């Protein structure tokens, strides 16, 4: 993706404060609450019936940390999202069969959680830089779909 000095400094600096485990579990949990049809990929995770159930489900929390840990490694490679996510793309398309629309949904939800967590420090321009980032990531993960 294309980020200005301004925007790159903003992303990296906020990321420095993120506890990937805590934020990853929240981002995944809210995804399955807010857009319930995404539960279709997590049948083996347990009871996902109500909000309280999703949020404190250990398999949800676990899976949240993994996804966000991978997302984190991508931030170190803002210049070549495509090659960084080439293997995972192939996994999602070929083995997991996940509609790439879900990557866009996650991205929006992660923006929300970062807003909720950070409050006023998550200003308009910061938002803006994160929006390019999650769209870049979503596009890099959808690249190998054929």
């Amino acid at each position: 993706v294309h980020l200005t000095p301004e925007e790159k400094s903003a992303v990296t600096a906020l990321w420095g404060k993120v506890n990937v485990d805590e934020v990853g579990g929240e981002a995944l949990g809210r995804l399955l609450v807010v857009y319930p049809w995404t539960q279709r990929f997590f049948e083996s995770f347990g009871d996902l019936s109500t909000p309280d159930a999703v949020m404190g489900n250990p398999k949800v929390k676990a899976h949240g940390k993994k996804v966000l840990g991978a997302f984190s490694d991508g931030l170190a490679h803002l210049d070549n999202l495509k090659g960084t996510f080439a293997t995972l793309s192939e996994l999602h398309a070929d083995k997991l069969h996940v509609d790439p629309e879900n990557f866009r949904l996650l991205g929006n939800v992660l923006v929300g959680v970062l807003a909720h967590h950070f409050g006023k420090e998550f200003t308009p321009p910061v938002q803006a830089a994160y929006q390019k980032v999650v769209a870049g990531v979503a596009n890099a993960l959808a690249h190998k779909y054929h």
């Binding site: 857009y35 049809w37 069969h97 779909y145």
Partner: protein, 141 residues
């Protein structure tokens, strides 16, 4: 919402589809699969080669449901009730794909109905497909 004129345009064109309903449905799906390959993520259990029995069957089920919808245009919510439930609780197709399939159904209609696919019909059909899409996604959350 569908105007009374939209209702007429729809019955008119579909009437025309008639017995080919099932064949047009299979073709709409084939167009979808080639044009929009992320849609294939919803059928990993299907043989998606050209003319496969599975694609042909699903095509016919799709057309029947559209037929049912034209038949009961003034009562879609009731007439597609079961199908709203199925897509809502079991299939859980992301709503965006409905626009893709709608587009491909439109394309197929255009290719098959040279005389009937006027600008006014075109518009009524697009609204009709959009309405069907709305009903099928209405119980999602």
């Amino acid at each position: 919402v569908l105007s009374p004129a939209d209702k007429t345009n729809v019955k008119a064109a579909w009437g025309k589809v008639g017995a080919h309903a099932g064949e047009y449905g299979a073709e709409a799906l084939e167009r979808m699969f080639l044009s929009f390959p992320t849609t294939k993520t919803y059928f990993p259990h299907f043989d998606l080669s050209h003319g496969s029995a599975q694609v042909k069957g699903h095509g016919k089920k799709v057309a029947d449901a559209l037929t049912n919808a034209v038949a009961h245009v003034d009562d879609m919510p009731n007439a597609l009730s079961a199908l709203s439930d199925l897509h809502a609780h079991k299939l859980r197709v992301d709503p965006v794909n409905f626009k893709l399939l709608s587009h491909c159904l439109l394309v197929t209609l255009a290719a098959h109905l040279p005389a009937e696919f006027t600008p006014a019909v075109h518009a009524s059909l697009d609204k009709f497909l959009a309405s069907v899409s709305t009903v099928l996604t209405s119980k999602y959350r």
